[PDB]
Design a protein around this ligand. Structure first.
Ligand SMILES: Nc1ncnc2c1ncn2[C@@H]1O[C@H](COP(=O)(O)OP(=O)(O)CP(=O)(O)O)[C@@H](O)[C@H]1O
Ligand SMILES: Nc1ncnc2c1ncn2[C@@H]1O[C@H](COP(=O)(O)OP(=O)(O)CP(=O)(O)O)[C@@H](O)[C@H]1O
Ligand SMILES: [Mg+2]
Ligand SMILES: [Mg+2]
Lengths: 494, 494
């Protein structure tokens, strides 16, 4: 009877929805883009509704657009953008403010405070995190002490708090269930990860009512029913990253994917143990082969695809991300030019909130082409950067990096990236790797699948890139690249 | 009989010819562009021929196009780009290597040598100069020990060496005269300036035959005739900048112009006595009110309009230098972006051959416009940097800066310029301020005039810009500016 599953994806810039057969084949897609709100510089918001509305659309458009009825899909997997915070009136069921995205650097001040009172090691140690406006902790607060009743209503459990997923659910289930998953939970910088629970330290340190917090659940389990009509299940929950990780099947120690989207996220499986980063990476919760807590080593990069949109949208040196390859090849090389994408400051490994984007090594004969390719190169550099750590923290040698994401399409890229890592690179057959998880995980959760090995087939690698440049070559470049970064760091006056 | 005078102006990017009436009016202009060779990054050459040639023309059409005839013009003034070096086969009359442009940084090594054999002072004292790939000494050599027989033929006076002007003449005069003027001579970094003659030290130190050297002369004198046909005369020399010094009439202690063209060249008249730079400026040979030796305090900026062509040609962010102004006003500000034009390394006050161009403080919302503006602004900054020198070396306060060049057309600029200086900016009425001079001198050379109080009236300032920004502001920016420069110094690995 029920021949399908539905992956729901809430992303930084658009809501998506996906259907697949039991052979795990992408039955179809729905996709509505929503408004990137930049209240001011460094700031980002979204319309929690906007987010919502889109997505729901999405969901439906599919049904119909393929003519599947509620009676044929098993359940609902679910993924999302990750740091992005929400709070709302529950009775009312209304937001008392937009959402603030992980992107947003509005919560820098705070960080500083925390900073001084040496809570690094507590945070770093009970969250695998670090101090940064990246994680909600701070955000939430921001609001709290930005809103009037807030803290009260909050306290009197009047107000609610969620995460893209969190929020998402409340909706579906009509305010019935108030949960999250660990992967997601993790993220907040208010949760104990070898504890698997909210964390008084923070909680109070950050000054937040234990009230508005959701019931943090497993990532592959049954949370509730949705009457889309006809009650559909929701047995999926992981942040998109986790999601792609799982969807990329990295589901056992030393398994790692590098994702290439708005920014870059290379995650690594420690399966059962949380390892601590010595080199400015992140320790984070993940999905084990059944929807169960795992650990992971994460390197997060702020600017990746974005550099390219900039390039196209604000710079206008191009019309198409696509185009970037054509031009890049147009030139033999980058002509000594280096580009640092700290539009948002830095990040793994660096975590320099004062770094700004910078262009380097300009000469008279340098042109847009050069600029453009340097921009791309910029992206492998980073990936390496971080990977180094990962090795350093991992105590592991990857001979193959398996990628995924928007840009994995760019062959130039791909190639270059390999040439630079010195490692071989695996470009999978399927591409919606993320949803892939969400879906799985969910269906797995329903014994829609008994095993992963099933789906293990949809993990065909389509292209592996082999390193084709000399070692010299390699470090040659990497050098000037660091040269740069240094010069980029600490731009913003304190 | 003979009603005109023909100025010849060989430039960094284009050959120019100009005609003028005894009332000193630009009868006409011819103008042909020649190719900027970037053999490799930091390197720049020209084709002595394509120089030749293009410079041969302009004259031609400027006659023709105004129907003047050899028999109506009196003589020929000559101005050129200054450091650019040439050397050729005489018999044959051919270059054994493209022209190395003052702007070219290929002889930095050498410089470094010179540096550690402790010859600053001597240089810095006999030359007015500084150790920098800017001056020719180093260049010649480069060649020398770079070509095969060279030094020999060199030695058996088989080879010839000159500067733009020198080269030019030889040409015209089909190999009859081998000379140059002081202004131009100065520039080599192989000429004693309180001595007015080639300087052995240098000569051998640099290891350069006294042969291939041209006869050094007075900037206003009669070197010989041209059979453009109909023998015409050549009675003036000067380097492009110094020319404009004159043709702006800065002809007494404290007279100071700031030119605005490919680069920036703010000079300042000392006259008879010759100040010594304490702050990274140059001491050079100027033209006295009678076409008789003077001294100057010169700051030299490498990139200035040039940055704008780039913007235009290579980057392509505009189609018209003109367009800059528009776009720039299109934004309230530069949104913190700062830009540094070391496409050829630095220069006064700095002198860092290893600086490379750079952009700074890029944020997400920064755009082409901002970029663009920053590039212009970049121009002003510089001018200030130098001017400070100028003061700190002059022990003088200018309350007004009289400019000139291509870009003075830009008012934004100008405005900004003044706002940054905290001083007023005088835009004259006439613009070929340069050719002007060259023309003078050449005819002043021939009684085609018989003093400048004549011409004097042509010095009408049309536009006056007055500082419209507060003090704070002023330095507030200067500051980040500096903050920027630093980060750009020493990019290049030596
Ligand atoms: N062919 C190509 N070559 C190079 N870069 C490309 C590319 N196609 C896309 N890019 C980049 O890919 C990104 C979009 O891909 P993708 O959707 O996977 O990222 P993403 O999912 O993080 C955005 P969200 O999280 O808001 O859904 C853009 O940032 C764009 O600049
Ligand atoms: N409207 C404008 N805005 C900005 N820059 C401008 C401009 N108009 C001209 N410029 C700049 O002015 C220069 C042209 O003027 P100019 O003839 O004085 O150069 P130049 O002769 O001093 C060195 P060359 O002899 O090699 O040309 C160019 O470098 C150009 O980029
Ligand atoms: Mg996504
Ligand atoms: Mg010129």
């Amino acid at each position: 009877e029920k021949k399908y599953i539905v992956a729901l994806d809430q992303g930084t810039t658009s809501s998506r929805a996906v259907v697949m057969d039991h052979d795990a084949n992408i039955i179809s897609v729905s996709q509505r883009e929503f408004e990137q709100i930049y209240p001011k510089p460094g700031w980002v918001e979204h319309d929690p509704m906007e987010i919502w509305a889109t997505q729901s659309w999405t969901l439906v458009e599919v049904l119909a657009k393929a003519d599947i009825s509620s009676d044929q899909i098993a359940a609902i997997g679910i993924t999302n953008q990750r740091e992005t915070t929400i709070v709302w009136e529950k009775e009312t069921g209304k937001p008392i403010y937009n959402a603030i995205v992980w992107q947003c650097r509005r919560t820098a001040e705070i960080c500083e405070h925390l900073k001084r009172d040496g809570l690094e090691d507590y945070i770093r140690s009970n969250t695998g995190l670090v101090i940064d406006p990246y994680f909600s902790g701070t955000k939430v607060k921001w609001i709290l002490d930005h809103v009037e009743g807030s803290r009260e209503r909050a306290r009197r459990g009047e107000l609610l708090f969620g995460t893209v997923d969190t929020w998402l659910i409340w909706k579906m289930t009509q305010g019935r269930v108030h949960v999250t998953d660990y992967t997601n939970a993790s993220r907040t910088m208010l949760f104990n990860i070898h504890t698997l629970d909210w964390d008084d330290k923070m909680l109070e340190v950050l000054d937040i009512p234990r009230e508005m917090l959701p019931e943090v659940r497993r990532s592959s389990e049954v949370y509730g029913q949705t009457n889309i009509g006809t009650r559909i299940p929701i047995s999926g929950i992981a942040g998109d990253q986790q999601a792609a990780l799982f969807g990329q099947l990295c589901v056992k120690e030393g398994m790692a994917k590098n994702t290439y989207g708005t920014g870059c996220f290379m995650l690594m499986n420690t399966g059962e143990k949380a390892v601590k980063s010595e080199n400015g990476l992140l320790t984070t919760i993940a999905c084990g082969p059944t929807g169960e807590v795992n650990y992971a080593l994460e390197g997060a990069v702020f600017m990746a695809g974005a550099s390219i949109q900039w390039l196209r949208d604000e710079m206008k040196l191009i019309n198409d991300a696509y185009d970037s390859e054509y031009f890049a090849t147009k030139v033999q090389n980058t002509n000594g030019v280096y580009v640092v994408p700290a539009f948002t400051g830095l990040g793994a490994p660096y975590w320099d909130p004062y770094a700004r984007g910078a262009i380097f090594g300009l000469t008279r004969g340098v042109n847009a082409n050069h600029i453009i390719r340097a921009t791309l190169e910029s992206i492998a550099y980073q990936t390496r950067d971080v990977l180094e750590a990962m090795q350093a923290d991992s105590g592991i040698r990857l001979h193959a990096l398996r990628v995924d994401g928007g840009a994995v399409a760019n062959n130039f890229l791909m190639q270059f990236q390999s040439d630079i890592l010195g490692t071989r690179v695996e470009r999978p057959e399927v591409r919606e790797v993320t949803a892939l998880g969400a879906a799985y995980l969910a269906g797995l959760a329903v014994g829609f699948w008994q095993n992963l090995d099933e789906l293990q087939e949809k993990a065909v690698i389509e292209r592996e890139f082999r390193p084709g440049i000399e070692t010299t070559e390699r470090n040659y470049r990497y050098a000037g690249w660091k040269k740069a970064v240094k010069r980029a760091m600490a731009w913003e006056e304190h």
